[PDB]
C-alpha cells in the first residue's frame, strides 16, 4: 500500500483487504459462507437419509472451509465421518463409496452418480456407460441376421402450451382508477 492509500479493492470494487490501524499489516477479507452445498437425496415418502457434496474442497480441509466448529451438531455429523469420499467434483459425505458400476440414478458430477439401495443406505459410484462389448472383426468374416423382430417405440413431443392472457390493470392495480392513472405514465408496456 502507498502511504496515502488506506483500502484496497478487487474487480468488484468491494473491499478486498484492510490495513489494520493499530498494527500496520494488511489482512484480506473472505466471506464466511464460501463454498456451495448440494444435497443428494432420495425422494421423500421413501427415506429421510441424505448426503452432502461440498464442491471444490479437499476432504482434509472441509471443516475449516465450511466452518464446522460453528455449525450445529446435525451439520457436524455430515462435516466429517467414515463415509467421506473424494471426487473430482468435491467431497461427498453421507454416502458409502461402491466399486460396482451402475446406471446413473441421481447425477452428482464428474462421472459420479448415486442411488438409494437396500444394506439400507445411499450409495455413490462411478456410472456404468453400458455393458462393455467387443466386436469379432476380421477381414473375411460377416455376421448376417437370420431372424428379426418388429418393435414399437413411443416418441412423445410437446406441441402447444396453455394460451395464457393477462390484464395488467387487475394484476398491478386491481380495479383502482388512481393506480391506473399513475400507470398510464408508463405508456405502452402493457400493450406490448
Amino acid at each position: 500500500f502507498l502511504p496515502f492509500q488506506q483500502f484496497g479493492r478487487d474487480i468488484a470494487d468491494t473491499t478486498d483487504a484492510v490495513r489494520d490501524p493499530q498494527t500496520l499489516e494488511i489482512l484480506d477479507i473472505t466471506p464466511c459462507s464460501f463454498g456451495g452445498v448440494s444435497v443428494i437425496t432420495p425422494g421423500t415418502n421413501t427415506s429421510n437419509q441424505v448426503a452432502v457434496l461440498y464442491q471444490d474442497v479437499n476432504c482434509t480441509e472441509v471443516p475449516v472451509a465450511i466452518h464446522a466448529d460453528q455449525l450445529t451438531p446435525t451439520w457436524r455429523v455430515y462435516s466429517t465421518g467414515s463415509n467421506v469420499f473424494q471426487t473430482r467434483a468435491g467431497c461427498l459425505i453421507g454416502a458409502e463409496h461402491v466399486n460396482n458400476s451402475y446406471e446413473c440414478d441421481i447425477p452428482i458430477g464428474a462421472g459420479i452418480c448415486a442411488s438409494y439401495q437396500t444394506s439400507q443406505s445411499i450409495i455413490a459410484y462411478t456410472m456404468s456407460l453400458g455393458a462393455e462389448n467387443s466386436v469379432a472383426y476380421s477381414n473375411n468374416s460377416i455376421a448376417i441376421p437370420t431372424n428379426f423382430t418388429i418393435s414399437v417405440t413411443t416418441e412423445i413431443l410437446p406441441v402447444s402450451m396453455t394460451k395464457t392472457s393477462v390484464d395488467c390493470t387487475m394484476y398491478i392495480c386491481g380495479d383502482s382508477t388512481e393506480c391506473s392513472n399513475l400507470l398510464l405514465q408508463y405508456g405502452s408496456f402493457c400493450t406490448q
Binding site: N140, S141, T153, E155, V159, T162, C168, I172
Partner: protein, 179 residues
C-alpha cells in the same frame, strides 16, 4: 406470479388500498411507483420465460410436423429420426398439449457368423454381387441380401462382371452356374 403480489418491493405494504388509505399523493406515489415497477418487472420476467418456452415448443412442434410428414405420410430414411431401427411406419396419437408417435421399426434379431469375400473368379473374370453380398457356409458360395439371411445360387443374373480377378483383394475361386 400471484405470489409476487405479496411482495413489498421495499414498500410499507403490498396492498395498494392500504397505502392509499394511509398515505397521500406527494409521497404515496413513490410507494405506488415501487409496487408498479416491481409487479411490472414480474410480468416482464414471466412473459420473457413464456417466450423462451414458446420458442422451445415451436421447435418441438416443427420437429413433430416433420416426423408426421416423413414417417406417417411416408417412410423416413433418416436413421433414428423415427425411433431406433430401420423405420417402417409411425402412428400418431393425440395428447394434452402434445403428440405421441408409435414408431414401428424393423430390428435384426438372431444372427450367425459366416465367411465372405468381395468377388468371385470364374474364368479369370471377376464377378461382383449385383445386390447383396457373397457368403459361404464352408461348402457353397451364395448371394444374399445384407439385412436378412436368404442365400441363392450364384448366376450371371445375380452378379455382374467388371475387369478381372487379378486386381481385387479378397476374391476367391469358385464357379458361376450358367443357365
Amino acid at each position: 406470479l400471484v405470489k409476487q403480489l405479496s411482495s413489498n418491493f421495499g414498500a410499507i405494504s403490498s396492498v395498494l388500498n392500504d397505502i392509499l388509505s394511509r398515505l397521500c399523493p406527494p409521497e404515496a406515489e413513490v410507494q405506488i411507483d415501487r409496487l408498479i415497477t416491481g409487479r411490472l418487472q414480474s410480468l416482464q420476467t414471466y412473459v420473457t420465460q413464456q417466450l423462451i418456452r414458446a420458442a422451445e415448443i415451436r421447435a418441438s412442434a416443427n420437429l413433430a410436423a416433420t416426423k408426421m410428414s416423413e414417417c406417417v405420410l411416408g417412410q423416413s430414411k433418416r436413421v433414428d429420426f423415427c425411433g431406433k431401427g430401420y423405420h417402417l411406419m409411425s402412428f400418431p396419437q393425440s395428447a394434452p398439449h402434445g403428440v405421441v408417435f408409435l414408431h414401428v421399426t424393423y430390428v435384426p434379431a438372431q444372427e450367425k457368423n459366416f465367411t465372405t469375400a468381395p468377388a468371385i473368379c470364374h474364368d479369370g473374370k471377376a464377378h461382383f454381387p449385383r445386390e447383396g453380398v457373397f457368403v459361404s457356409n464352408g461348402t457353397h458360395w451364395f448371394v444374399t441380401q445384407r439385412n436378412f439371411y436368404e442365400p441363392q445360387i450364384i448366376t450371371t443374373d445375380n452378379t455382374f462382371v467388371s475387369g478381372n480377378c487379378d486386381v481385387v483383394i479378397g476374391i476367391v475361386n469358385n464357379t458361376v452356374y450358367d443357365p
